[PDB]
Amino acid sequence: GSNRDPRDHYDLLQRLGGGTYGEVFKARDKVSGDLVALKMVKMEPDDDVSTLQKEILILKTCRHANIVAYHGSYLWLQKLWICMEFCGAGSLQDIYQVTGSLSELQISYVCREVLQGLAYLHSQKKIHRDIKGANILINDAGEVRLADFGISAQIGATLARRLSFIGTPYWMAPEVAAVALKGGYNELCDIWSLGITAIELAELQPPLFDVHPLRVLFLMTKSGYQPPRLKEKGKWSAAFHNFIKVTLTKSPKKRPSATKMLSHQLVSQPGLNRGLILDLLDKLK
Amino acid sequence: GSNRDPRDHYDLLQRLGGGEVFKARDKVSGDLVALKMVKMEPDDDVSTLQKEILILKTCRHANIVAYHGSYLWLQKLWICMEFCGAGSLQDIYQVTGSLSELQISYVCREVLQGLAYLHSQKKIHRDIKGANILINDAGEVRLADFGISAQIGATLARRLSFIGTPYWMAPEVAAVALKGGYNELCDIWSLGITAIELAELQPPLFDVHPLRVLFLMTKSGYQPPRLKEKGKWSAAFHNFIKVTLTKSPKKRPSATKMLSHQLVSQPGLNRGLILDLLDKLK
Ligand SMILES: CCN(CC)CCNC(=O)c1c(C)[nH]c(/C=C2\C(=O)Nc3ccc(F)cc32)c1C
């Protein structure tokens, strides 16, 4: 990247979102006039810039239609600015909080595009680790995009010990919870999270959203633990109930991959296109 | 690193611990080393492992195992390091029983020196415990690695935290299941749990389910653990435990500040205390 003021190339506009992790702002390229998203990562004076730089190189090497495009980065006065593709409708959580439940075909389309993104991430030896409505972006043309590629499947692989992770517990696979008492998870943890995300788009929250997050992880490690299910049987077709059953299979040895899931009836059926989301975006008035 | 068989330079002697480690001897110098072996799959990315190795090459301190080189051969990645003859403190205490207070004080002083270094290099260990603290035949103390960068997933527009063993994790690491993050002071808490582990042979609440231990750390009225038998230990050891086990990371002292504590500043802390403990194995 460059050590320069990003205002040299962009007009900084409205705050789109943020958290403790950092902020994201709308902006416009001064030359082209195209809108972009600018991730702003705040640094402390003693933070190691080289580690941030290393992460950026992953954005420079990975490219896919269903992951937000990367345009460049600016390090300036303890702020790291990352230029990404703008997605006008924000996240699916921003959309379903206004619009209400998504239709079965809208969820089918979302899942297909997210599986295309996951199949790519996984082939590049990355694991997303937090697939959920808030981390799936939608543009004005109704196209689906992941906000990042995740990070390497091998974290601390050279260490003589294992490291587990905590993403958002309601979307975490059982074997990630079990790393607190056993060893190992792999890229299939993202397939379970996609199944919870389908329930989250159908119903307006994931299963057990009112239970404490560490109790949700605890219940997943007990024997006789039953994976979650759609609460209304009649409202959804057999194909959707099966997609939920196979994506939410308890054992990762029996859970299908992103490539295998792209052959499932729910996401292989005709009539899945960006137009179904353009209909969802029309419900904002 | 090299793309060649490590057996070109090393005589492999013994399997040590399962993520596989071998004791070996250098063919030219005759010096013993530990060789870590990582099995790779045909489609694994080589650069990701070699990026990790570089971190190993950049960091150097007496209280972390020395790195000697690496070898890639037929989908096996080998990392050559300093050999620590007595193994881990857990391998030692499972035979010898409880460590003495002076032995614990010397161990903590040495680990704090390693952590102060590790933290100045912007790393976090994330799993300080007896099994991850090595001892050599001379009774010197070494961490088995330098940890990983303090920032993992920093560029992501989301919170993602990487987690060690629940019984040794700080309350703010448990709170990550609800909101926010944590910092390097989580290793100071883990060292306080390790001191109780070396004194009692188990960390606090070892019979409670690991996720239940973490759940209790997020509740209102949570109270940190203490040493069980008050009269066996001096007030300096009780105070060391009290300050390292400060619930709030904002009030918990740094490794540098903990190095001025009476327990680890007292005279007579040297490798001889550990040579005594190693005599109990024989
Ligand atoms: C439907 C609109 N919403 C109300 C319901 C408004 C709230 N949501 C919004 O403003 C919003 C918009 C319009 N874009 C983003 C985020 C990103 C974007 O565009 N490219 C990225 C690339 C990476 C990244 F990590 C985030 C983004 C948000 C949160």
Ligand SMILES: CCN(CC)CCNC(=O)c1c(C)[nH]c(/C=C2\C(=O)Nc3ccc(F)cc32)c1C
């Ligand atoms: C006497 C042996 N004991 C039986 C009671 C314990 C068994 N354990 C043993 O033998 C043992 C010994 C003698 N060294 C190690 C490991 C390491 C070593 O030396 N340098 C490293 C550097 C990095 C690392 F990740 C591991 C090691 C073990 C497990």
